[PDB]
Amino acid sequence: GGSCRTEGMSCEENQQCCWRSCCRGECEAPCRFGP
Fold first, then answer.
1. CB 3.0 to 4.6 Å from 11: which of 15, 23, 26, 30, for a disulfide?
2. DSSP bridge pairs for 17
3. How far is CA 4 from CA 22, 24, 31, 35, in A?
């Protein structure tokens, strides 16, 4: 519900994140922790 999450805001996936990109806790681009 409501407005999308911006970069670095907390989430569960692309579908709430306005970046349409990977999120395992915050709105991100690389779909993996560390290198």
1. 23
2. 5
3. 14, 16, 19, 27
Single-letter code of the amino acid located at 7: E
The method of structure determination was NMR
7 HSE (CA, 13 A, CB side): 2
Tokens of 15: 């579908």
- Burial call 2-29: b when 16+ CB within 10 Å, e when fewer: eeebeeeeebeeeebbebeeebeeebbe
Instruction: Report the number of secondary-structure helices (H) and strands (E) in the chain.
Output: 0, 0
Q: How far apart are CA 24 and CA 32, in angstroms?
A: 9
Looking at the structure of the chain, the number of domains it has is 1
